[PDB]
Design an enzyme around this catalytic site. Structure first.
Site, PDB file in Angstrom:
ATOM      1  N   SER A 197       0.875  -1.183   0.000  1.00 42.09           N
ATOM      2  CA  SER A 197       0.000   0.000   0.000  1.00 42.09           C
ATOM      3  C   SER A 197       0.917   1.239   0.000  1.00 42.09           C
ATOM      4  O   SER A 197       1.761   1.264  -0.880  1.00 42.09           O
ATOM      5  CB  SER A 197      -1.074  -0.072   1.092  1.00 42.09           C
ATOM      6  OG  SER A 197      -0.566   0.258   2.368  1.00 42.09           O
ATOM      7  N   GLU A 324      -9.271  -5.521  -3.059  1.00 40.61           N
ATOM      8  CA  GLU A 324      -8.599  -4.370  -2.430  1.00 40.61           C
ATOM      9  C   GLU A 324      -9.573  -3.324  -1.772  1.00 40.61           C
ATOM     10  O   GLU A 324      -9.196  -2.653  -0.790  1.00 40.61           O
ATOM     11  CB  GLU A 324      -7.629  -3.676  -3.421  1.00 40.61           C
ATOM     12  CG  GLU A 324      -6.490  -4.536  -4.035  1.00 40.61           C
ATOM     13  CD  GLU A 324      -5.294  -4.697  -3.100  1.00 40.61           C
ATOM     14  OE1 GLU A 324      -5.408  -4.296  -1.920  1.00 40.61           O
ATOM     15  OE2 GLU A 324      -4.240  -5.244  -3.510  1.00 40.61           O
ATOM     16  N   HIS A 437      -7.428  -6.075   1.272  1.00 40.89           N
ATOM     17  CA  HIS A 437      -6.249  -5.217   1.371  1.00 40.89           C
ATOM     18  C   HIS A 437      -5.431  -5.637   2.605  1.00 40.89           C
ATOM     19  O   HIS A 437      -5.977  -5.788   3.670  1.00 40.89           O
ATOM     20  CB  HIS A 437      -6.721  -3.794   1.496  1.00 40.89           C
ATOM     21  CG  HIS A 437      -5.687  -2.746   1.212  1.00 40.89           C
ATOM     22  ND1 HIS A 437      -4.952  -2.706   0.036  1.00 40.89           N
ATOM     23  CD2 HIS A 437      -5.340  -1.634   1.917  1.00 40.89           C
ATOM     24  CE1 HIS A 437      -4.158  -1.645   0.063  1.00 40.89           C
ATOM     25  NE2 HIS A 437      -4.389  -0.967   1.182  1.00 40.89           N
TER      26      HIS A 437
END
Ligand SMILES: CC[C@]1(c2cccc(O)c2)CCCCN(CCCCCCCCCN2CCCC[C@@](CC)(c3cccc(O)c3)C2)C1
Ligand SMILES: *[C@@H]1O[C@H](CO)[C@@H](O[C@@H]2O[C@H](CO)[C@@H](O)[C@H](O)[C@H]2NC(C)=O)[C@H](O)[C@H]1NC(C)=O
Ligand SMILES: *[C@@H]1O[C@H](CO)[C@@H](O)[C@H](O)[C@H]1NC(C)=O
Ligand SMILES: *[C@@H]1O[C@H](CO)[C@@H](O)[C@H](O)[C@H]1NC(C)=O
EC number: 3.1.1.7
Length: 528
Positions: A197, A324, A437
């Protein structure tokens, strides 16, 4: 002694730690910069003055000051991401895990944590380097860097708060590895940087910044890329948010110097209490203080840098998870919640879209909607929920990463692309959130080899293919040992899955949707 190490900044002492019924060394909380406190807040970091005597690197350092998630108090799924150490502005430290006995010149991996640039720690359970170091025999470093406004408050023109300083923290930790990792058995000419990320975006940014390129060999990007729409802002927008920050604390706003002075007198938690108030839109997957396109760290725009090949040419390996978007919808879109199947009404869908593409005019919202709606079943709540999930994940993570990989490959020296889609069997988040995620990290870091943690054996196995791919790629620039992970080429566009089922190779990862986000929508908003 194996635990004593003499470095260019002074001598350092670690501690043995047990690992899967064995032991390795850890040097924890080694400083790599001067504490950025007092009149140094918002400033570029300075090299740590050496010390004499022996540095006690036997325990984890503080975590940088950050916003703390309290959406689900006592819930481990969220709480394991929060700082597990005292927070303080004195946090520029790094951590090293060295195999035992000490290597002479082995592969080094440096981990950069994500957290949308507003949050993160090097010290979290899922980032424990001992499993990776031990299993793959690499020297594992994790750095740290200022987040939120401490790391990214940007008044372009000032030298007191220039922006990007968080990115400069990272670079210094990397300077320090380049310089000193040799004494720990690491090979400074085989350092792979990797992160997830904002850490994945950071890695891309170091690949682009001329001042970072010479400090590492290869790169791995997990679910993040430098051109993500949430990962950077113009100098005008950073300036605007800095001022608004000030306006929230009743600061004197008549000059940059006046404003910075006021911000520097404020307790850390004051800045954090109002950080979110400066977003210019009502929006999901957007963060207040993030890198700025300043013409210094980034010499021109990311997109023109990418088109012209202005960037480090090397091998990269990167990829995304199947779902995600779900976190961001859970935390902010109406209709979604932790304990329900979160089936979404047409009305809630429409507002999800507006929150997910905050910069779109009504015509753009119409196009996102048309693109993601099964019109022969528009009142299906599962379909609405999943379409919204794909919108968030496509727009914020997958399509930007595909753009980056497509441009990188035209000039780079080898690309390997993965799609991670195993839902952990011990996951505490609800079924509807999917392959979430952040949840490939525990595989990459090897948590499924500790039995107390309750993974299936096919999960321990997958974790081992992943670590061996990551490590073999770090050591040689190819994740294959001499069944194949093929190279991603601009012609064929191949990639692999990563899950317990035997691996397959696919092509053109979400092209239909990414042509919409990367080519069509931008054109439509330029015109209207
Ligand atoms: C790497 C840390 C983390 C994360 C945080 C923030 C952004 C991100 O991409 C990833 C990885 C994924 C696991 C869940 N993260 C926390 C989820 C927070 C979502 C953002 C909601 C903030 C809105 C509060 N206002 C932790
Ligand atoms: C990565 O670069 C290496 C080294 O520059 C490339 O290897 C060369 O390939 C050229 C073009 O075929 C040959 O003429 C040379 O014999 C190779 N040089 C060396 C030193 O091996 C390699 O092809 C590149 N890999 C990718 C995927 O781009
Ligand atoms: C520093 O190291 C000493 C031994 O040198 C040890 O007692 C401890 O692990 C460290 N200090 C603490 C408790 O923070
Ligand atoms: C593994 O299983 C036990 C027993 O159900 C569970 O309570 C325990 O907390 C699990 N280990 C962890 C830390 O999840």
């Amino acid at each position: 002694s194996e635990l004593l190490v003499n470095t260019k900044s002074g001598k350092v002492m670690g501690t043995r730690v047990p690992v899967l019924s064995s032991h390795i060394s850890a040097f924890l909380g080694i400083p790599f910069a001067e504490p950025p406190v007092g009149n140094m807040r918002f400033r570029r970091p300075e090299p740590k003055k050496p010390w004499s005597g022996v540095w006690n690197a036997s325990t984890y350092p503080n975590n940088c000051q950050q916003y703390v998630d309290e959406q689900f108090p006592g819930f481990s799924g969220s709480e394991m991401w929060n700082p597990n150490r005292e927070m303080s502005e004195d946090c520029l430290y790094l951590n090293i895990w060295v195999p035992s006995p000490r290597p002479k010149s082995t592969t080094v991996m440096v981990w950069i944590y994500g957290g949308g640039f507003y949050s993160g720690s090097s010290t979290l359970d899922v980032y424990n380097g001992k499993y990776l170091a031990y299993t793959e025999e690499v020297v594992l470093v994790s750095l740290s860097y200022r987040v939120g406004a401490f790391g990214f408050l940007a008044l372009h023109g000032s030298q007191e708060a220039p922006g990007n300083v968080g990115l400069l923290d990272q670079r210094m930790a990397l300077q320090w590895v380049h310089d000193n990792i040799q004494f720990f058995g690491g090979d400074p000419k085989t350092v792979t940087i990797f992160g997830e990320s904002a850490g994945g975006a950071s890695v891309g940014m170091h690949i682009l910044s001329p001042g970072s390129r010479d400090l590492f060999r290869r790169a791995i990007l997990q679910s993040g890329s430098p051109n993500c729409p949430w990962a950077s802002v113009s100098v005008a927008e950073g300036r605007r948010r800095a001022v608004e920050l000030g306006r929230n604390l009743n600061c004197n706003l008549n000059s940059d110097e006046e404003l910075i002075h006021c911000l520097r007198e404020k307790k850390p938690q004051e800045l954090i209490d109002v950080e979110w108030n400066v977003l210019p839109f009502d929006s999901i997957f957007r963060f207040s203080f993030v890198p700025v396109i300043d013409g210094e760290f980034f010499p021109t725009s990311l997109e023109s840098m990418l088109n012209s090949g202005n960037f480090k040419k090397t091998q990269i390996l990167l990829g995304v998870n199947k779902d995600e978007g779900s976190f961001f919808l859970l935390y902010g879109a109406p209709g979604f919640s932790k304990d329900s199947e979160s089936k979404i009404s047409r009305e809630d869908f429409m507002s999800g879209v507006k929150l997910s593409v905050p910069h779109a005019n009504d015509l753009g919202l119409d196009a996102v909607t048309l693109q993601y709606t099964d019109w022969m079943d528009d009142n299906n709540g599962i379909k609405n929920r999943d379409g919204l999930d794909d919108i968030v994940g496509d727009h914020n993570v997958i399509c930007p990463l595909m753009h980056f990989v497509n441009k990188y490959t035209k000039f780079g020296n080898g690309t390997y692309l993965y799609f991670f889609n195993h839902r952990a069997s011990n996951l505490v988040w609800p079924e509807w959130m999917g392959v979430i995620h952040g949840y490939e990290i525990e595989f990459v870091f090897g948590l499924p080899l500790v039995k107390e943690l309750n993974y299936t054996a096919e999960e321990e196995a997958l974790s081992r293919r992943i670590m061996h791919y990551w490590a073999t790629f770090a050591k040689t620039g190819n994740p294959n040992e001499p069944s194949k992970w093929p190279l991603f080429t601009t012609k064929e566009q191949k990639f692999i899955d990563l899950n317990t089922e035997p691996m397959k190779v696919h092509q053109r990862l979400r092209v239909q949707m990414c042509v919409f986000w990367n080519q069509f929508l931008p054109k439509l908003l330029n015109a209207t």
